[PDB]
């Protein structure tokens, strides 16, 4: 009854989708990673904290917008906030940093 | 990027018809792709997005590569505390189409509600990951995986088999630099990858793939190689416990290596959760 | 290099995906049914017009809002942009026209006397929830009245109750005798005539209101096609419609809204009573958590798929696009997503109701299906549908599969079916061909009814019946000949599937002919 | 609980085998041709009327024995026996005639003067081969002469010579001119004029040697149905027979058969060149390791289906029935796996042209074909056929395809097909239906030819031709239906699928009807 | 270009068939089992040391015939020429006893043979005797009390391997009167078959009784128990064997109707199946015994039970050196079937050709098994097989997904019981199993699984359990580097457990060949 596994067991893809399951409740485990655009909104330090806590994996800086002073700033309150929760090693979840980069544009 | 940044992962982001068209070698020569949406769904017709989309997902899956889709996804969360039909059927999609990540731009950078946009992705992604279809996902993926001489991919592949097959609650990996841990990932297990690295880098990096959850080992070097081994397993067990993927009693797939240093995973174990 | 038939040759679903062409363009046909919500932006002759030259196939008439006099004068605005092109039969687009009925809704009253007037909500104020009608119309930041006179009875202190397409929620604190104190959760802007949902309670509402009844009388005397009927629980909802429409409306198609938990957990009940299904996405996002909403849509789509009846996928499909002229990336992935899990029908309502861009709506509902219908991976489709259909010894099933794979192996242009009730060609859709089936009739209700089938093209022929039993025939194979020559379907040349029967009557489809389009 | 109908709807193959009933029986029809090579012990009237009431549809006539006159009369008895069941069309069957050349075969000489005379040769002993024809009748223990000339030049020292479909080996010890010397590795009885096998060796007999030459217009004069060409090495062998057939013999079926190393090795291109296929397995067992000889069977039958030519399975499926009127449990096993192989007809040789027993073999073959036709898992077979057949706009292909989906789906007892050349009902064979393929002619020889494909029952039609071509093809098609009553393929109200064409001639089947039988 | 490698390739089935290819060599390792009846052209121990060396793994002993005396010399003989090969233990090849019981047999009268029977006719059957001392065609005799209680008017009756029929057509009481079907050679005291009928003899007669007792004390491997009908039958045997006999498997021959319709609690209850064609293509018509051979080995493959295929598999060869074309397809396709052992009979028991009768079937079985579609056949045993949450079943499974993935040599596997080879052999691995233990009787048993090549280490129990471990790895690293499995550098999968002792195999390692 439980992670779709009546519509995991089904012989064909049709049946399998006749078998989803709106009362068949997930696994805790969740393996999608989530990548979230950090900005005004999302980078107080308490903020970050709720973020990662929420299931944020990944912090992307987006460089078409801002200077290094900014950027480097919110890098160093994604670290404060992910560092937060070291004391732990059992619950601390690690948080990467991804550049996106301008790239060649029209402005 | 240079000597100094070659282990910081290349993600290129495919915005146009050109992108598409070269995708291959684009493929080839980066770490993964973005499916960048926006720009994409400019430079092409919009009602041709999904048709790259799909079209690169497939072949990263195949690759083995992450891949990313971005971009408006819960667009309407940046003003309303709740997605649109159209955006919650969008992630579910991506998650089942194969993504390995989902991404957050205006909804996360500038909107009215960025946590909730954080959480409403987690929920269906969760919710998606249940309706795969792994019977069939996994028969195809080793029908299309090249037969090697590689142990690891020998090593992977036998590990997912046994995780299906004894239905565990996870596949833990000792990695140091991800690859192993990554070889796993790429044959879509139901169970979450716990991936127990000390390298905070891996540790990071490891987000970039479907299922890897990735622990950050602290604790120092013990002495007996084999008990530093099991030292990690257990903390792996104790991570799982805690975030309740798994309790005792239940049985998990762990992978190690028959020596230390990379490249060496060649053992899968079927072990009870102590 | 063109339908995605590299991708259609492939031998997994995996490989499929991997040969997904940007560059491979799709065929002139287009499958998938368009519905279109009549409202102010659509309601003009001239703009119904274009809606239809756009692909508009159903329009949709929403029995919340409007009285008797303002429908008849849409069905009668419809009706005349549809005749319009009755001029040319080879060109005609048969227009059906759907009611949707109200059902069961809950609504509040007017912020502070008006239609318009908004307050504003904080996270973890006091609203009071009022039955009282002394502020029906006198809804405000403090007290709100709604129209739900057991609302006590079923709500209780934890509750949750949702405001306007669940934007603002609300958590019972306190509950009073014909009132209840409640948190705001999720504030926002409140307006007037806001719908209500409460999704952990059974809701004590009739199934058909008298209102219902009455709506349900006039779609009769209006010559309606079908019936969109909303918040669907149970087989016994379906009989209470069934019943209303009566003798008079036996021939009218009943299509029952899923949008409850009720109706998911009563989904096969419910279909085996219904004429078809639409996935009512606006409520049911409501009524269940939104992140499961895609796992009852598919479940819905396959079991109907199944069944072969037909199924809408319904609800903020482009919603952006009442505001803007282009569609959000999850609004195209959204319309190709619900193509390729089987839906027969995709709707627009307020993108074609009230929006800025009703017709650009339209035409990208019509370039996206196109787009993904040659997507559809044909291969596995076929056969896991021809593996779950039962063996009968029905002829006409027997003569479609056949049909259906024949198409299949010449690649046909199309499948040309004649047909009096329309049930051939049904029976042609639950296959899926990736060929257009160029319905044939002479009846025109066969023909509006018919766009609530994946891939059926119905065609009104109006030529008189010619005497030869054997020339009436061919004369209406040859006009199905000129319609797809005419929307360039096919070409001299090319070879088609023709369906026929051994008598005039109906159920007597048992031929099937591959035929060269002269 | 009725032709293994339950392991039909089984999802995998092991599943399918888990399914497999005794106590499921078959239906009547049987799909698999029955080849029965004709020689002393059926040859009389009286015993061929019984094996074509047993089931014999292709009469064999072996050409490495008998001359012209004893063949004439064969054939003659063949056609006596065919013709006494004239008098009723409905009941009556066709029997071709094949002839099966000698071919590049090698032969010993006569033991001691005598053609039944026989030598027990000793284990170890010294044997000599000679050319010397003073020899040639004079054969012993120590002498053995063979027919090959060219022997010497061919076979190198230590080389293995085999002698009586390779019971008996011998090797090469002494090379010499004129002669050889060997030793007896496999001892046994040694008869008179036994089949000499050189597996290591370039035979270069000639494909077509001037006794084939002298039996090939033989059977063009005799008005022969088909040709087993044996030892067919090469396209070019196929091409020779052909113009050795000339215009005369134009339409007489070339089956080649496959029985050395070099035929296997060039088998596409033999197929390519020839109507069908033969496994000659005795020869083709000792020309190349005895455990090899089933991925040959298995390979040649898969690339004959996938090319919807016919293959026959040859040689020793029932042996022991030459002595006993039971077979053993190796030679049921043989008979049921080359029709699940996929095998068009199988054969007997010397348990109906010698044994003591032809009747019980024929019906033995009749029984386990039918129980291993119902054994087929038709639903991985139809899907496997679909996927690897190209897509074509050949109208007829698309028609025989919708047709065998189509009898699939209802269950239907028969595919009845007009045809002239047997092309059509070919067409429906290449899919594999499970229900029997009625194939109407009035052409004889085309009802004859029919025997060479699974599943196609010829009935060849004498009523006159009617004026109104349709009322000629109603005809043909009342024909069918009461052969199909008659011989209880079906019943009244049963469905049927039957196939007609758009006009007369030959080309232009594209008609597909789904039928009650009256 | 090897091992029928790109018809293994293929997408479907059909195109499979088509790229099989004779050109294509098969790999040097025979995966199955090969069992061999002992008798007068097989029993001298210099005849059994060549039968050894062309590849029997099994002597099976026929108890329909001989004393114990003869029976106790025979197994004498086949252990003194198995151990005569024990000098190499890395070419020592284990070989297994059977014994195969009589079972409940029905029997006639007497001659003071081969008499005249007149095909239509009637005869007499009674119990009393009457017509005791002479057997001619008018009256006969039987042995079975409870006939009239399981066979009624128009139920048929063989007699002498079915070879005379005759149908009931008055009862009964103690006599039947007949019509004759069949006219053959009569016998005296001959065998008598009634299809369709639930005879209701004992499962295990006095004879078998004393048979099975004397098998425990001969220390036989396996007992092939003769005419199983039910469940209970095998718990007879079981109950017969007892704690001395525990370890014996017990193999149930499917002889007859009754058998057929309740094989799912006969299997449940044995520890395999043989398909006894001989007797069942007496019992049921001879047409349909294909339909219950498949089924049977099927059901037999999900279950993850050994199956013998068994009867007239290379018959000809009794008289000739060479088998017929349908003796070579019947044994390829047994193999195909999913057969984890293939029989001889009187090929080896009294013919005149035994070795090449055993050298057929090895090079037979060896072409068979490259030919085997793994692609359909492992996603198959995989989508059938259940989700347990037993380690052993999930190391399995996991090595052979891994030995499919790295195309390994061999499937190593340290085992006491056998059962963690089982549970590999379940799976169908293309690479043969080398089954590591220190059990002897563990080694001769591994014989009745597919894929399976015991190896019997003789090696002395190391203190460090680790070292101990890596000798027993190495040991089956050097057999299979000596029968040219595998050389140096080629990747194996190893198959080892977390402690000693039975049912702890949970680790799989992909080891390079030292
Ligand atoms: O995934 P990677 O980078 O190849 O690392 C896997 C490696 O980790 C190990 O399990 C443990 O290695 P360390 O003890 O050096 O961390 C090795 O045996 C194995 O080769
Ligand atoms: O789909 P339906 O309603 O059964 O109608 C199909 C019918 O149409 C026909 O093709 C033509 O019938 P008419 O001549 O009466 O229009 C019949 O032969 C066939 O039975
Ligand atoms: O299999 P063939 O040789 O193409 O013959 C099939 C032909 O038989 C028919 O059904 C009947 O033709 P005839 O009336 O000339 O015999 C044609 O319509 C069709 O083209
Ligand atoms: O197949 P079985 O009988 O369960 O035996 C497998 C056992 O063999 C071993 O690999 C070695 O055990 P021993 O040291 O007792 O021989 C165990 O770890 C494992 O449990
Ligand atoms: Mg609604
Ligand atoms: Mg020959």
Same mark, same amino acid.
């Given at each position: 009854?439980?992670?779709?596994?009546?519509?995991?067991?089904?012989?064909?893809?049709?049946?399998?989708?006749?078998?989803?399951?709106?009362?068949?409740?997930?696994?805790?485990?969740?393996?999608?990673?989530?990548?979230?655009?950090?900005?005004?909104?999302?980078?107080?330090?308490?903020?970050?904290?709720?973020?990662?806590?929420?299931?944020?994996?990944?912090?992307?800086?987006?460089?078409?917008?801002?200077?290094?002073?900014?950027?480097?700033?919110?890098?160093?309150?994604?670290?404060?906030?992910?560092?937060?929760?070291?004391?732990?090693?059992?619950?601390?979840?690690?948080?990467?940093?991804?550049?996106?980069?301008?790239?060649?544009?029209?402005? | 990027?240079?000597?100094?940044?070659?282990?910081?992962?290349?993600?290129?982001?495919?915005?146009?018809?050109?992108?598409?068209?070269?995708?291959?070698?684009?493929?080839?020569?980066?770490?993964?792709?973005?499916?960048?949406?926006?720009?994409?769904?400019?430079?092409?017709?919009?009602?041709?997005?999904?048709?790259?989309?799909?079209?690169?997902?497939?072949?990263?899956?195949?690759?083995?590569?992450?891949?990313?889709?971005?971009?408006?996804?819960?667009?309407?969360?940046?003003?309303?505390?709740?997605?649109?039909?159209?955006?919650?059927?969008? /992630?579910?999609?991506?998650?089942?189409?194969?993504?390995?990540?989902?991404?957050?731009?205006?909804?996360?950078?500038?909107?009215?509600?960025?946590?909730?946009?954080?959480?409403?992705?987690?929920?269906?992604?969760?919710?998606?990951?249940?309706?795969?279809?792994?019977? !069939?996902?996994?028969?195809?993926?080793?029908?299309?995986?090249?037969?090697?001489?590689?142990?690891?991919?020998?090593?992977? /592949?036998?590990?997912?088999?046994?995780?299906?097959?004894?239905?565990?609650?996870?596949?833990?990996?000792?990695?140091?630099?991800?690859?192993?841990?990554?070889?796993?990932?790429?044959?879509?297990?139901?169970?979450?990858?716990?991936?127990?690295?000390?390298?905070?880098?891996?540790?990071?990096?490891?987000?970039?793939?479907?299922?890897?959850?990735? /622990?950050?080992?602290?604790?120092?070097? !013990?002495?007996?190689?084999?008990?530093?081994?099991?030292?990690?397993?257990?903390?792996?067990?104790?991570?799982?416990?805690?975030?309740?993927?798994?309790?005792?009693?239940?049985?998990?797939?762990?992978?190690?290596?028959?020596?230390?240093?990379?490249?060496?995973?060649?053992?899968?174990?079927?072990?009870?959760?102590? | 290099?063109?339908?995605?038939?590299?991708?259609?040759?492939?031998?997994?679903?995996?490989?499929?995906?991997?040969?997904?062409?940007?560059?491979?363009?799709?065929?002139?046909?287009?499958?998938?049914?368009?519905?279109?919500?009549?409202?102010?932006? #659509?309601?003009?002759?001239?703009?119904?017009?274009?809606?239809?030259? #756009?692909?508009?196939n159903?329009?949709?008439?929403?029995?919340?809002?409007?009285?008797?006099?303002?429908?008849?004068?849409?069905?009668?605005?419809? +009706?005349?942009?549809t005749?319009?092109?009755?001029?040319?039969?080879?060109?005609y687009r048969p227009v059906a026209?759907?009611?949707?009925?109200?059902?069961?809704?809950?609504?509040?009253?007017?912020?502070?006397?008006?239609?318009?007037?908004?307050?504003?909500?904080?996270?973890?104020?006091?609203?009071?929830?009022?039955?009282?009608?002394?502020?029906?119309?006198?809804?405000?930041?403090?007290?709100?009245?709604?129209?739900?006179?057991?609302?006590?009875?079923?709500?209780?202190?934890?509750?949750?109750?949702?405001?306007?397409?669940?934007?603002?929620?609300?958590?019972?604190?306190?509950?009073?005798?014909?009132?209840?104190?409640?948190?705001?959760?999720?504030?926002?802007?409140?307006?007037?005539?806001?719908?209500?949902?409460?999704?952990?309670?059974?809701?004590?509402?009739?199934?058909?209101?008298?209102?219902?009844?009455?709506?349900?009388?006039?779609?009769?005397?209006?010559?309606?096609d079908?019936?969109?009927?909303?918040?669907?629980?149970?087989?016994?909802?379906?009989?209470?419609?069934?019943?209303?429409?009566?003798?008079?409306?036996?021939?009218?198609?009943?299509?029952?809204?899923?949008?409850?938990?009720?109706?998911?957990?009563?989904?096969?009940?419910?279909?085996?009573?219904?004429?078809?299904?639409?996935?009512?996405?606006?409520?049911?996002?409501?009524?269940?958590?939104?992140?499961?909403?895609?796992?009852?849509?598919?479940?819905?789509?396959?079991?109907?798929?199944?069944?072969?009846?037909?199924?809408?996928?319904?609800?903020?499909?482009?919603?952006?696009?009442?505001?803007?002229?282009?569609?959000?990336?999850?609004?195209?992935?959204?319309?190709?997503?619900?193509?390729?899990?089987?839906?027969?029908?995709?709707?627009?309502?307020?993108?074609?109701?009230?929006?800025?861009?009703?017709?650009?709506?339209?035409?990208?509902?019509?370039?996206?299906? +196109?787009?993904?219908?040659?997507?559809?991976?044909?291969?596995?489709?076929?056969?896991?549908?021809?593996?779950?259909?039962?063996?009968?010894?029905?002829?006409?099933?027997?003569?479609?599969?056949?049909?259906?794979?024949?198409?299949?192996?010449?690649?046909?242009?199309?499948?040309?079916?004649?047909?009096?009730?329309?049930?051939?060609?049904?029976?042609?859709?639950?296959? +899926?061909?990736?060929?257009?089936?160029?319905?044939?009739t002479?009846?025109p209700q066969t023909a509006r009814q018919a766009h609530?089938?994946?891939?059926?093209?119905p065609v009104l022929?109006?030529?008189?019946?010619?005497?030869?039993?054997?020339?009436?025939?061919?004369?209406?194979?040859?006009?199905?000949?000129?319609?797809?020559?005419?929307?360039?379907?096919?070409?001299?040349?090319?070879?088609?599937?023709?369906?026929?029967?051994? +008598?005039?009557?109906?159920?007597?489809?048992?031929?099937?002919?591959?035929?060269?389009?002269?």
């Open positions: 009854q439980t992670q779709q596994l009546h519509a995991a067991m089904a012989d064909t893809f049709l049946e399998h989708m006749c078998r989803l399951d709106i009362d068949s409740p997930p696994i805790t485990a969740r393996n999608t990673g989530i990548i979230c655009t950090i900005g005004p909104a999302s980078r107080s330090v308490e903020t970050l904290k709720e973020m990662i806590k929420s299931g944020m994996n990944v912090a992307r800086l987006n460089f078409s917008h801002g200077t290094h002073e900014y950027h480097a700033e919110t890098i160093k309150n994604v670290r404060t906030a992910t560092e937060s929760f070291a004391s732990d090693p059992i619950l601390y979840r690690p948080v990467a940093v991804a550049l996106d980069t301008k790239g060649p544009e029209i402005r | 990027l240079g000597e100094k940044g070659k282990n910081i992962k290349i993600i290129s982001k495919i915005e146009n018809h050109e992108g598409v068209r070269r995708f291959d070698e684009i493929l080839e020569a980066s770490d993964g792709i973005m499916v960048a949406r926006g720009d994409l769904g400019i430079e092409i017709p919009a009602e041709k997005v999904f048709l790259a989309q799909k079209m690169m997902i497939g072949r990263c899956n195949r690759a083995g590569k992450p891949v990313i889709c971005a971009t408006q996804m819960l667009e309407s969360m940046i003003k309303k505390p709740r997605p649109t039909r159209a955006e919650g059927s969008d /992630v579910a999609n991506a998650v089942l189409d194969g993504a390995d990540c989902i991404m957050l731009s205006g909804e996360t950078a500038k909107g009215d509600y960025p946590l909730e946009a954080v959480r409403m992705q987690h929920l269906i992604a969760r919710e998606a990951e249940a309706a795969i279809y792994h019977l !069939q996902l996994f028969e195809e993926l080793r029908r299309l995986a090249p037969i090697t001489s590689d142990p690891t991919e020998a090593t992977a /592949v036998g590990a997912v088999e046994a995780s299906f097959k004894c239905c565990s609650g996870a596949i833990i990996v000792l990695t140091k630099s991800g690859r192993s841990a990554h070889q796993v990932a790429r044959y879509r297990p139901r169970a979450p990858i716990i991936a127990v690295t000390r390298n905070p880098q891996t540790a990071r990096q490891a987000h970039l793939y479907r299922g890897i959850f990735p /622990v950050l080992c602290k604790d120092p070097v !013990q002495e007996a190689w084999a008990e530093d081994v099991d030292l990690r397993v257990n903390f792996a067990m104790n991570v799982g416990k805690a975030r309740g993927f798994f309790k005792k009693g239940d049985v998990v797939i762990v992978l190690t290596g028959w020596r230390p240093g990379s490249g060496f995973t060649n053992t899968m174990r079927v072990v009870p959760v102590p | 290099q063109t339908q995605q038939l590299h991708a259609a040759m492939a031998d997994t679903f995996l490989e499929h995906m991997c040969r997904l062409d940007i560059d491979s363009p799709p065929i002139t046909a287009r499958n998938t049914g368009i519905i279109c919500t009549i409202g102010p932006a #659509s309601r003009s002759v001239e703009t119904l017009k274009e809606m239809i030259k #756009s692909g508009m159903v329009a949709r008439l929403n029995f919340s809002h409007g009285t008797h006099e303002y429908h008849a004068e849409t069905i009668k605005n419809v +009706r005349t942009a005749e319009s092109f009755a001029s040319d039969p080879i060109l026209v759907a009611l949707d009925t109200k059902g069961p809704e809950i609504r509040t009253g007017l912020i502070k006397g008006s239609g318009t007037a908004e307050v504003e909500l904080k996270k973890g104020a006091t609203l009071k929830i009022t039955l009282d009608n002394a502020y029906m119309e006198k809804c405000d930041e403090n007290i709100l009245w709604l129209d739900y006179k057991n609302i006590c009875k079923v709500v209780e202190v934890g509750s949750k109750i949702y405001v306007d397409d669940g934007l603002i929620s609300l958590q019972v604190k306190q509950k009073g005798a014909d009132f209840l104190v409640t948190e705001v959760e999720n504030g926002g802007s409140l307006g007037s005539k806001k719908g209500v949902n409460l999704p952990g309670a059974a809701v004590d509402l009739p199934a058909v209101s008298e209102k219902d009844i009455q709506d349900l009388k006039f779609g009769v005397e209006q010559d309606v079908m019936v969109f009927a909303s918040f669907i629980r149970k087989a016994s909802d379906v009989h209470e419609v069934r019943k209303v429409l009566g003798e008079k409306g036996k021939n009218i198609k009943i299509i029952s809204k899923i949008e409850n938990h009720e109706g998911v957990r009563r989904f096969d009940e419910i279909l085996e009573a219904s004429d078809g299904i639409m996935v009512a996405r606006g409520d049911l996002g409501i009524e269940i958590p939104a992140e499961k909403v895609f796992l009852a849509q598919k479940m819905m789509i396959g079991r109907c798929n199944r069944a072969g009846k037909p199924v809408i996928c319904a609800t903020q499909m482009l919603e952006s696009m009442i505001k803007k002229p282009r569609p959000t990336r999850a609004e195209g992935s959204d319309v190709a997503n619900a193509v390729l899990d089987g839906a027969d029908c995709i709707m627009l309502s307020g993108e074609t109701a009230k929006g800025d861009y009703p017709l650009e709506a339209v035409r990208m509902q019509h370039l996206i299906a +196109r787009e993904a219908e040659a997507a559809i991976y044909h291969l596995q489709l076929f056969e896991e549908l021809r593996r779950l259909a039962p063996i009968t010894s029905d002829p006409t099933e027997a003569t479609a599969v056949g049909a259906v794979e024949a198409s299949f192996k010449c690649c046909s242009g199309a499948i040309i079916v004649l047909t009096k009730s329309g049930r051939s060609a049904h029976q042609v859709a639950r296959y +899926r061909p990736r060929a257009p089936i160029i319905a044939v002479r009846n609530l089938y994946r891939g059926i093209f022929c109006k030529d008189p019946v010619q005497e030869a039993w054997a020339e009436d025939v061919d004369l209406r194979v040859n006009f199905a000949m000129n319609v797809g020559k005419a929307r360039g379907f096919f070409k001299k040349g090319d070879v088609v599937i023709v369906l026929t029967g051994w +008598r005039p009557g109906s159920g007597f489809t048992n031929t099937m002919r591959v035929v060269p389009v002269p």
